[PDB]
Amino acid sequence: NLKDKILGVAKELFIKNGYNATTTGEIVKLSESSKGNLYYHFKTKENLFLEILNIEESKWQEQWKKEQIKAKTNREKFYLYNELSLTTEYYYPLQNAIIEFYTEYYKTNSINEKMNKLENKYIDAYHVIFKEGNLNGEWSINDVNAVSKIAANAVNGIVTFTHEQNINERIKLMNKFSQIFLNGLS
Amino acid sequence: NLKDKILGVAKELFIKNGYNATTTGEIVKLSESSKGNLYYHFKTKENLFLEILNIEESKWQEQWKKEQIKAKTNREKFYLYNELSLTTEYYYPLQNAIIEFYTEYYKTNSINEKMNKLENKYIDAYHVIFKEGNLNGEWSINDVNAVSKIAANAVNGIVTFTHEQNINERIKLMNKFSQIFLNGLS
Ligand SMILES: Cc1cc(N)c2ccccc2[n+]1CCCCCCCCCC[n+]1c(C)cc(N)c2ccccc21
Numbered sequence: 238n239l240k241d242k243i244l245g246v247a248k249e250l251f252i253k254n255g256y257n258a259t260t261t262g263e264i265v266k267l268s269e270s271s272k273g274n275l276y277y278h279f280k281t282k283e284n285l286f287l288e289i290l291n292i293e294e295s296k297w298q299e300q301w302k303k304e305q306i307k308a309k310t311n312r313e314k315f316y317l318y319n320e321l322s323l324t325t326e327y328y329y330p331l332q333n334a335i336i337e338f339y340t341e342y343y344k345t346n347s348i349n350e351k352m353n354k355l356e357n358k359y360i361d362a363y364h365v366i367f368k369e370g371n372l373n374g375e376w377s378i379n380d381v382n383a384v385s386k387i388a389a390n391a392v393n394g395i396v397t398f399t400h401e402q403n404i405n406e407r408i409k410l411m412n413k414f415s416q417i418f419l420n421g422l423s
Numbered sequence: 424n425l426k427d428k429i430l431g432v433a434k435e436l437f438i439k440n441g442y443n444a445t446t447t448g449e450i451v452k453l454s455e456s457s458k459g460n461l462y463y464h465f466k467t468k469e470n471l472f473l474e475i476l477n478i479e480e481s482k483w484q485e486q487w488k489k490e491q492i493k494a495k496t497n498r499e500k501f502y503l504y505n506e507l508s509l510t511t512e513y514y515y516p517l518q519n520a521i522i523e524f525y526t527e528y529y530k531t532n533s534i535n536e537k538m539n540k541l542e543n544k545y546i547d548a549y550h551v552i553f554k555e556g557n558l559n560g561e562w563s564i565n566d567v568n569a570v571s572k573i574a575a576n577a578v579n580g581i582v583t584f585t586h587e588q589n590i591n592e593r594i595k596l597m598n599k600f601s602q603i604f605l606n607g608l609s
Pocket residue numbers: 333336397398399400476479480481482483508511512514515521522525526538541542
């Protein structure tokens with residue numbers, strides 16, 4: 238494909254280097270397409286990156302729906318989602334690139350809108366789990382949105398800031414975190 | 424002292440122009456030193472920057488040592504340290520150079536090793552709060568080292584990935600997080 242091999246080489250570059258480290262020159266010299274091509278579907282470079290995120294959050298959310306069956310209670314789904322978070326090949330590997338990205342486009346207005354459209358997708362899985370768990374009598378959260386937002390970011394914190402220590406050490410901490418947290422809700 | 428003039432000047436240069444754009448030549452001339460002296464004390468730009476981070480971590484510890492006295496109990500120190508990490512990062516000028524430097528050097532083991540020492544010093548403050556809270560009966564935690572690493576990265580996530588929200592909402596969520604988490608310990 239064309240408008241799909243771009244998105245591919247781009248994802249690979251944003252991860253391998255960083256957001257700025259990868260230039261449109263590079264994406265082209267390895268995705269072979271005149272500068273203009275990258276201009277139709279993808280208006281700007283911040284469009285191509287914001288595009289990659291959407292796909293990634295979708296592939297990830299999709300992977301979780303196909304794996305969440307292995308958890309019977311919402312309590313178990315919480316532990317599971319946070320554990321799988323450390324291993325997916327989806328979305329989470331772009332978090333550094335996203336931190337970089339936001340530091341260099343937070344002076345524009347169309348940024349806080351798109352970076353907040355994704356926010357809703359990103360915390361959705363937690364919203365389901367906490368609401369569904371309210372319905373299933375697993376706990377009683379008065380402010381579901383607040384808690385989903387906290388859970389999502391705290392977890393994104395664990396996944397992102399421990400990216401060097403042995404993987405099983407990380408799963409261990411994440412489980413202790415999921416424990417402290419749900420225990421905190423009831 | 425010349426070493427300190429070099430560090431002071433380099434810090435300001437990194438802040439005004441960012442990590443990559445600052446040249447050691449600028450650092451050399453503006454501090455009235457030499458490539459030789461700079462090489463002698465730091466070996467490289469990356470090292471210089473890491474040394475600056477060291478000093479910054481120490482000033483931060485000193486500031487905390489003076490601030491925590493406002494918080495009688497450890498439950499309070501925890502609430503306060505988490506709020507301080509969120510509010511003071513909003514206007515910490517080196518933050519930008521820091522993002523730029525990390526999301527570009529976490530691949531090297533030389534650098535990522537030294538960064539971990541820094542990170543570990545930040546985590547220590549949680550260790551102290553948690554150990555001290557044990558000896559005071561504020562809670563009973565059997566795995567202080569672990570809970571400390573979890574708290575630190577959870578908080579960093581909340582501080583780091585929540586930037587699009589309004590400042591009061593972020594402070595509301597950080598406190599709710601502190602409340603949930605401290606409640607999950609008992
Ligand atoms: C004085 C002073 C004054 C303040 N008002 C202040 C305010 C807020 C914070 C520190 C402050 N300090 C001093 C602060 C010194 C901070 C030194 C930090 C070193 C390490 C960064 C580690 N790191 C890791 C592990 C993992 C990541 N994925 C990652 C991603 C992006 C960026 C960094 C990353």
